[PDB]
Design a protein around this ligand. Structure first.
Ligand code: SAH
Lengths: 265, 265
């Protein structure tokens, strides 16, 4: 008896690691959640087909409130897996579920899978130069979140890049676009006026990482804010000071304006 | 006419994704490099047997000096794969290779795989709280580099965690251990007196991420500096102030002392 947290990867069902597939195939019960991220290139059926097991999908409430009532009981008598998009423990609160497993006497194992957190490397930006990350959250009611704006400011002060995860309302099938996140940011800048995010800010958009042809675009907010980046999911990145080879790659691979080649050192 | 950058993942031959494996099997020629890092849980023979293709290994000079003369020519009239440990393009210099492909008129696609950059999610530390990353380098001769110490200081200053890659002599298969990294940083502390890394600093050690049995340990330097964390590779993390949920994961899963619950939160 054991519980496995198995990541499914960035885009489709083949983004699972071979390790994860052969372990998932021999589990007695398989559960999964698809609310922490969007795998735009597959379906439940295709995943079930690949793993050869029926998958029961859990909602945020089933997990956050009933994980120990729905999943853990089986794991005491059987080999159980819990599948998630990307890497199970990245920008989720799933790590705490391991604590629940322990206090229920269930041993758990983690099988990693490609994550958007490291897949940003395809933007050409040096991974080590990424600072603190943040999430753009949809304003709801009279509440307008803005903390992600300060993260950008503090990273950019240090010359660090900022990775911006975008909001998701899976049960409403709403996936925030980079365009939406740019609009939100311009609005917070008119409030705070820190010169952090303007029409002239260089940004990078990565859409559907993991697919064979993801959309990778770099340019000024004024030029990109109304551009079509294709289907979700999307992440937005606000680079800090660029190394020359970073700029080179943004121009050659992501279609950035030639002039960012001229780095002001 | 196509070059595929395929990641092999964290630890053994099963850490490659299903997508990467299937694509590698259909490639006419398969290259790989093991200088940016090593796949400590497997061998080149086991990877070859899994892919069912002979793998020509390239040195760092083969790649950096002659990538366009060794790999790209074949990719003009064949499907070629270039394998690398972890996630492709996380290593600083690899992105550039895609520009070389473009220049040579060769199509390139990136197949992602788990990277230690994202796998540290398994320490229970929130991914978004990681700041700039650094590598602890072995000093030698009259050269004692210490920038990695500076990186810790300005992340922790901002309440951020610091991911520290450890030095490696890929070709001699010599891995720097977390213990050596800790002693070094105490050495740098004695040099710089910044109050950044001392006996009382809380650290996290992650060894053999990707394995089903990785070592995850958290505690104060005075206690962990001579502890055996098992076979390489080792990764060292100097956490910033912890969220209570991070601290209880470290206590419950990483064997951290209860003391962190009131000293580091
Ligand atoms: N393939 C992909 N392409 C672009 N953005 C992606 C993505 N997968 C995830 N994201 C981003 O991350 C958000 C979910 S955050 C959860 C991330 C997941 N554990 C992982 O390891 O990737 C999405 O709303 C989106 O902004």
């Amino acid at each position: 008896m054991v519980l496995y947290f198995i990541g499914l990867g960035l885009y489709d069902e083949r983004d699972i690691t071979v390790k994860g597939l052969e372990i998932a195939k021999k589990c007695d019960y398989v559960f999964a959640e698809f609310y922490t991220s969007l795998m735009a290139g597959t379906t439940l059926g295709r995943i079930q087909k690949l793993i050869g097991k029926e998958i029961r999908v859990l909602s945020r409430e089933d997990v956050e409130l009933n994980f120990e009532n729905i999943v853990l009981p089986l794991a005491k008598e059987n080999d159980v897996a819990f599948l998630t998009p990307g890497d199970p423990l990245v920008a989720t609160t799933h790590a705490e579920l391991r604590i629940r497993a322990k206090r229920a006497g269930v041993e758990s194992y983690v099988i990693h899978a490609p994550s958007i957190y490291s897949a940003v490397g395809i933007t050409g930006l040096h991974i080590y130069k990424f600072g603190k990350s943040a999430t753009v959250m949809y304003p709801e009611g009279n509440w307008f979140p803005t903390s992600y704006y300060d993260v950008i400011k503090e990273n950019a002060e240090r010359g660090l890049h900022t990775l911006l995860f975008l909001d998701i309302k899976a049960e409403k099938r709403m996936y925030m676009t980079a365009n939406e996140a740019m609009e939100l940011l311009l609005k917070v800048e008119d409030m705070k006026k820190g010169g952090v995010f303007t029409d002239d800010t260089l940004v990078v958009v990565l859409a559907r990482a993991g697919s064979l042809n993801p959309t990778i675009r770099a340019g000024y907010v004024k030029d990109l804010i109304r551009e079509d980046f294709g289907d979700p999911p999307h992440i937005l990145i606000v680079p800090g000071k660029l190394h020359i080879v970073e700029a080179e790659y943004l121009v050659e691979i992501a279609g950035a304006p030639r002039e960012i080649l001229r780095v002001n050192v």
